[PDB]
Amino acid sequence: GIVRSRLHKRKITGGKTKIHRKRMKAELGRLPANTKLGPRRVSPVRARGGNFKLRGLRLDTGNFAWGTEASAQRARILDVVYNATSNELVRTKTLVKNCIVVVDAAPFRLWYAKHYGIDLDVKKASSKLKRKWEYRRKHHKIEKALADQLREGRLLARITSRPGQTGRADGALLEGAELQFYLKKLD
Amino acid sequence: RGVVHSTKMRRSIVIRRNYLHFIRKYQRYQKRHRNITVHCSPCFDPKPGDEVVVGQCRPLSKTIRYNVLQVV
Amino acid sequence: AKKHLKRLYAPKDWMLSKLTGVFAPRPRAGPHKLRECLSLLIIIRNRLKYALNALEAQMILRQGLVCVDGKPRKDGKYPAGFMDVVEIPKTGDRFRILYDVKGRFALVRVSEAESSIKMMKVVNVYTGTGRIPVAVTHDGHRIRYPDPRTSRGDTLVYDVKEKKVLDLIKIGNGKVVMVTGGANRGRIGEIVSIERHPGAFDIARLKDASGHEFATRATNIFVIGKDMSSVPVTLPKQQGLRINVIQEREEKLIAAETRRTT
RNA sequence: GAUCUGGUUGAUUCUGCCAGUAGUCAUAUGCUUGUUUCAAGGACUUAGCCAUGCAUGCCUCAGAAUCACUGCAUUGCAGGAAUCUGCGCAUGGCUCAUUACAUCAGACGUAAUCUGCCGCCAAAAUUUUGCGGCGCAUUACUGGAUAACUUGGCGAAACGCCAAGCUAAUACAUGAACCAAUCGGACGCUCUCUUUGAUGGGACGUCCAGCGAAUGAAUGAAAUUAGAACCAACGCCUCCACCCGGAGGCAGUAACACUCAGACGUGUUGACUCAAUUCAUUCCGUGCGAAAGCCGAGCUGCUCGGCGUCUACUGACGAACAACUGCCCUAUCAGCCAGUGAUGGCCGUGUAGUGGACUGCCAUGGCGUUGACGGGAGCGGGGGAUUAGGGUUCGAUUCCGGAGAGGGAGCCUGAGAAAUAGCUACCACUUCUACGGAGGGCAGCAGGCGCGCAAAUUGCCCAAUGUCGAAAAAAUACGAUGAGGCAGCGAAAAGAAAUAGAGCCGACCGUGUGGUUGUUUUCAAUGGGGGAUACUCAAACCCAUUCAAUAUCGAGUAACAAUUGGAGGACAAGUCUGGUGCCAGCACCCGCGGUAAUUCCAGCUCCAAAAGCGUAUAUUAAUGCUGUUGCUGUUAAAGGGUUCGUAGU
RNA sequence: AGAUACAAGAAACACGGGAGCAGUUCGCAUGUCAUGCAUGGGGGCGUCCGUGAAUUUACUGUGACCAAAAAGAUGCGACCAAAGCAGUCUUGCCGACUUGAAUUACAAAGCAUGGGAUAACGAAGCAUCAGC
RNA sequence: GGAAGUCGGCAAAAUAGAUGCGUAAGUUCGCAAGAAGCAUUGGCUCUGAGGGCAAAAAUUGCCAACUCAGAACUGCUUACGGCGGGGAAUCCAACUGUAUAAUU
Ligand SMILES: [K+]
Ligand SMILES: [K+]
Ligand SMILES: [K+]
Ligand SMILES: [K+]
Ligand SMILES: [K+]
Ligand SMILES: [K+]
Ligand SMILES: [K+]
Ligand SMILES: [Mg+2]
Ligand SMILES: [Mg+2]
Ligand SMILES: [Mg+2]
Ligand SMILES: [Mg+2]
Ligand SMILES: [Mg+2]
Ligand SMILES: [Mg+2]
Ligand SMILES: [Mg+2]
Ligand SMILES: [Mg+2]
Ligand SMILES: [Mg+2]
Ligand SMILES: [Mg+2]
Ligand SMILES: [Mg+2]
Ligand SMILES: [Mg+2]
Ligand SMILES: [Mg+2]
Ligand SMILES: [Mg+2]
Ligand SMILES: [Mg+2]
Ligand SMILES: [Mg+2]
Ligand SMILES: [Mg+2]
Ligand SMILES: [Mg+2]
Ligand SMILES: [Mg+2]
Ligand SMILES: [Mg+2]
Ligand SMILES: [Mg+2]
Ligand SMILES: [Mg+2]
Ligand SMILES: [Mg+2]
Ligand SMILES: [Mg+2]
Ligand SMILES: [Mg+2]
Ligand SMILES: [Mg+2]
Ligand SMILES: [Mg+2]
Ligand SMILES: [Mg+2]
Ligand SMILES: [Mg+2]
Ligand SMILES: [Mg+2]
Ligand SMILES: [Mg+2]
Ligand SMILES: [Mg+2]
Ligand SMILES: [Mg+2]
Ligand SMILES: [Mg+2]
Ligand SMILES: [Mg+2]
Ligand SMILES: [Mg+2]
Ligand SMILES: [Mg+2]
Ligand SMILES: [Mg+2]
Ligand SMILES: [Mg+2]
Ligand SMILES: [Mg+2]
Ligand SMILES: [Mg+2]
Ligand code: NA
Ligand code: NA
Ligand code: NA
Ligand code: NA
Ligand code: NA
Ligand code: NA
Ligand code: NA
Ligand code: NA
Ligand code: NA
């Protein structure tokens, strides 16, 4: 079937290589998963040496990391907004690595309230937790773009896992100059 | 080590190695050469005629197996 | 993959005649490399002469009756190698596998007290799951708590009955080593200096007991003690002293001629 | 052996070829052949086609017997056909069609990866069971199935098949609390204490906290300068005997608010985003049993040994990629590569993993007279032949590497295959049939047809060398193996070696009492052969020993009979005798043959080398006639019509 | 001892997580709720950072790394030999601590000497010169 | 079925637009050439490239015109008009042109 060898390629001199020997199982390729967005569906693949790869088909949730706070939450993906390969992938709603998506922001809002006491149930807390909140808020600063998105209800993130190889859709929230770079494109 | 031959591609250059080959029957030498394509970082700025030192790395493209380590 | 081994492809030091069969027993995976080992069938049949065929050796082996590291082995393809102690309790034989001054294998008799110790060379040190440091050995052992100053090139003395490390000898100038491979195998000398050459092979320069200098790759040396009187194992007859080929032939001719007078 | 000889002229000295000569594990054919040792043997042409038979299976004390099986006992002990289960069949054997940035060799890499069996090791996650209805404990006596079997059978058959009824597990599926440790993250309408509500200190309770995997954060050291002063709270030392409260200063000082006053402040490498640790959110079958396992011993209730298996980790045996240098002839092959990847870049996908390997976008690059691109012959190497030296030539073939199983494509299972005595389809051939259908793959061993100048038995055996495996050998009780070995056939080639020895007499020889030829003779020896108390051998054969140890056959024309080529020259050996008459024929070359042939056809003599010797084709030396060492160029073949001039030297 | 020349295998800084106890040379103390059963000039070692106007190949000497078979070679009266790696004798309930030595293998690659013949670089001389 | 019809393929049939690839002998080197030959073509929803004018300028704002190149989905009864059949040879005249108004 599909092969990954250099036998069918031209030489740097431009000449054609005469092929002897047949195709070996050690150099096979496989058809891409083309992961879409929807209720979860997976397909096991038996790889070399035993072991199973998971093919992602229609994933819809994952773990997304707030890098600045060194935390993560389980959130639901809402849509795909950008892709550096082609607009065709954005149109067809395909989840691949480095895709830019948006998430529901509900888990991150809840975590912020229970960690800093700021709501974008808080008033019913123990006195020692209230004292701990004051310390944490003493020298912590959030940024413009993140605070605006959390109030709105969605924020942008990029996929960090490879959905077609592990069957998981994990990512990290966008921050810093990266957030500005992609906001200007999404206009 | 080699001599810079062309710097047309993006972040890539071609170096040329010149060596002498010994023919046993005639007890004499003849000249040969070989061209190699390597990857060059922006921290270096070689020009044709320069001398470079390269080191082996994992396959980076169809024909690239070396990286520039020092420009003299 | 491969399961056979032709006689012409077998190691030269097994001393197998080319006119007796096509095949040789190939060693299995285990403690020692394929090209640097001596299988149990070769020792029992060809060296000690206790068996006449492979069938008779299988009678001896598949009963116990032969221990290689304090444990009986029932496999005739078990690879036995450098610094191993072969015991046959029924006949009361205890041997250690060393290298001759000509680079060939040599079985030297050892006492009961000495037969329980072994010297092993470290080849790698890494960290296990519970933050446990473990050292890997040329024989293939994995020791789970070596001394915190154990390094990659040195050696440690081991008790095979009670699995504990006796002591550790580090590699440095002025120590006694044995060459374990390549054109100098079986020689014993003192370390004079080591040239580094990062990214390539180190070179060790050694001096013989008679004052002759020779060099080899640093991966071929095996530390056996800080000085010749503190070596904890018995050495072969020649004590790793290579002599001139012209002189050696003369002595061999002088002998066996005085024997014919007597 | 650092060697040459015949042919151009009436004679001479040259250039130059033709012919002669020696070898070849180098093939074939002709004549001949007594003994013994050692050996290659359908590669060349047709990777052409195949009748038949055989080539891969495995059981121990230790996975599962109610054979309606057998032998002894008499409700048991043994052996156990058949089936299920576990492992192997990706090795070995065969062949050389394809093949020049390929394969291979020498040197290096994988920090870019996978790895069953083997070695040394590791393991503290999990609310189960019984009884009474959540409580109490002598808390591990768990579940359905399915084969062999019998009961009907279908079909012409088919290494074809259906349904019903039984019953096992180390097959399959569920499942285990206390015993039983340290270690740290979030909390609370809960208590208690100290200060003036405290990022205050201790308990109490309520969710997480095992290996492996995914994402994000931190750690994964430092190595370019010396003294002071204030304010915050942190640690210590002094007072005013302590307490109360209310004063003033850095002597010492790895860290750490108790039960642990040193229970990692230190991984590795040339180098790491690697090893490993902590924190946050996860894992739905696509992972994690103490096999809910099996044998020996000893003392229902216990103790000790030998095995077997799941998961995690890294050594060995390997696999797969990458490429620094090298490898025949050809220019009457000079330009090659890009739609549809050509050279490089960016984000991805796919893979066990790197990569234009592949999708999208961007730039115009990459290679070449130091011979690219195209064509011809060809599996690569270790090595063989010929040896003054330098060289020329061969290498299908025992060892190593690669590839293939009629052609060509696709794939399942597996740790490993793009497997072919595995599967699927097409093409070309091809077998049986009741005409519905079902089969095939000798470039494995033996054998057959065809092809050709050209190549062996449809043999015996696992005794040796090894491989697989539940496996030592033996005992109620014997694994397989055309891999391998042994013999048969065999003037490919190689080694040793018979076909006579010693004398008397008589007659002769040529030198001048010795050297030898002949026929009547004598007198010892020995094998080729015939056999054995026997040796060898898995058995048989060959070799070797012997022809009395009381007791063993044999040579005289020793018919037990040497051949193949030659006798003008090269080139060793006749000016012999008949026949033929430019005929027949010989002759590698020069030449011979028309009546006296040194050459034809024969007889007799003689020569070479000999159990061997001619002939054909290819190749090495002869050949300084391919010349680097080492040729020639006025007239023998050969200096460009002359200047300029780039690459090269 | 400094300067003159020479030494980046050098000079000048620094690192206790640096030298198995911080290398070589001119019973008393600390601690004691402790297994505190503890602890007490100049020159070479290791590891980093600034300093060159830095020196390199070919060649040659010596060594490393390089399957066997085959080829060259030591030893042994397989009756000799082509072979083989065996075998010998103090008459052995054995011994010789038995033997099986040691070589060559282009071209490329890798370590440490030598600097005569060469080769790769640089420069084209006011595009220069800063004295401690 | 495919020239068997006929003096004779007369008459009819037949090719056909555009785009991508490709193209022989001969030759006065200009040609031959649209030589020969193969493929695509609808509809619908989208994406990219190709510009002007203003401003205290790899920036921001405003705006026009219709070409070219791609992708997903979906369909066919091959469906207006208009629009070369091609090749291998022989004879004659070099070629464009003129020329028997009413049979050449
Ligand atoms: K990439
Ligand atoms: K398997
Ligand atoms: K056997
Ligand atoms: K006559
Ligand atoms: K000549
Ligand atoms: K034409
Ligand atoms: K016209
Ligand atoms: Mg004349
Ligand atoms: Mg049994
Ligand atoms: Mg089975
Ligand atoms: Mg094979
Ligand atoms: Mg190699
Ligand atoms: Mg538990
Ligand atoms: Mg600590
Ligand atoms: Mg061929
Ligand atoms: Mg070959
Ligand atoms: Mg052939
Ligand atoms: Mg042969
Ligand atoms: Mg053959
Ligand atoms: Mg194959
Ligand atoms: Mg065939
Ligand atoms: Mg196949
Ligand atoms: Mg077959
Ligand atoms: Mg056959
Ligand atoms: Mg048995
Ligand atoms: Mg049996
Ligand atoms: Mg055979
Ligand atoms: Mg013979
Ligand atoms: Mg005869
Ligand atoms: Mg006889
Ligand atoms: Mg005659
Ligand atoms: Mg003659
Ligand atoms: Mg003569
Ligand atoms: Mg001849
Ligand atoms: Mg005559
Ligand atoms: Mg010749
Ligand atoms: Mg000559
Ligand atoms: Mg002339
Ligand atoms: Mg002239
Ligand atoms: Mg040899
Ligand atoms: Mg007609
Ligand atoms: Mg008609
Ligand atoms: Mg018409
Ligand atoms: Mg043309
Ligand atoms: Mg056209
Ligand atoms: Mg005209
Ligand atoms: Mg006209
Ligand atoms: Mg008219
Ligand atoms: Na003449
Ligand atoms: Na005989
Ligand atoms: Na005979
Ligand atoms: Na296992
Ligand atoms: Na060849
Ligand atoms: Na092979
Ligand atoms: Na087939
Ligand atoms: Na023959
Ligand atoms: Na010659």
mmCIF file with all atom_site columns, C-alpha atoms (C1' of nucleotides) and ligand atoms in Angstrom, chain D residues 25 40-41 396-398, ligand 18:
data_model
loop_
_atom_site.group_PDB
_atom_site.id
_atom_site.type_symbol
_atom_site.label_atom_id
_atom_site.label_alt_id
_atom_site.label_comp_id
_atom_site.label_asym_id
_atom_site.label_entity_id
_atom_site.label_seq_id
_atom_site.pdbx_PDB_ins_code
_atom_site.Cartn_x
_atom_site.Cartn_y
_atom_site.Cartn_z
_atom_site.occupancy
_atom_site.B_iso_or_equiv
_atom_site.pdbx_formal_charge
_atom_site.auth_seq_id
_atom_site.auth_comp_id
_atom_site.auth_asym_id
_atom_site.auth_atom_id
_atom_site.pdbx_PDB_model_num
ATOM   1 C  "C1'" . C  D 1 25  ? 40.107 -26.908 -8.674  1.00 0.00 ? 25  C  D "C1'" 1
ATOM   2 C  "C1'" . A  D 1 40  ? 34.195 -31.036 -7.630  1.00 0.00 ? 40  A  D "C1'" 1
ATOM   3 C  "C1'" . G  D 1 41  ? 29.718 -32.874 -9.711  1.00 0.00 ? 41  G  D "C1'" 1
ATOM   4 C  "C1'" . A  D 1 396 ? 26.854 -18.601 -10.807 1.00 0.00 ? 396 A  D "C1'" 1
ATOM   5 C  "C1'" . U  D 1 397 ? 29.449 -21.934 -6.689  1.00 0.00 ? 397 U  D "C1'" 1
ATOM   6 C  "C1'" . U  D 1 398 ? 31.055 -23.987 0.666   1.00 0.00 ? 398 U  D "C1'" 1
HETATM 7 MG MG    . MG G 2 .   ? 32.547 -25.940 -7.236  1.00 0.00 ? 18  MG G MG    1
#
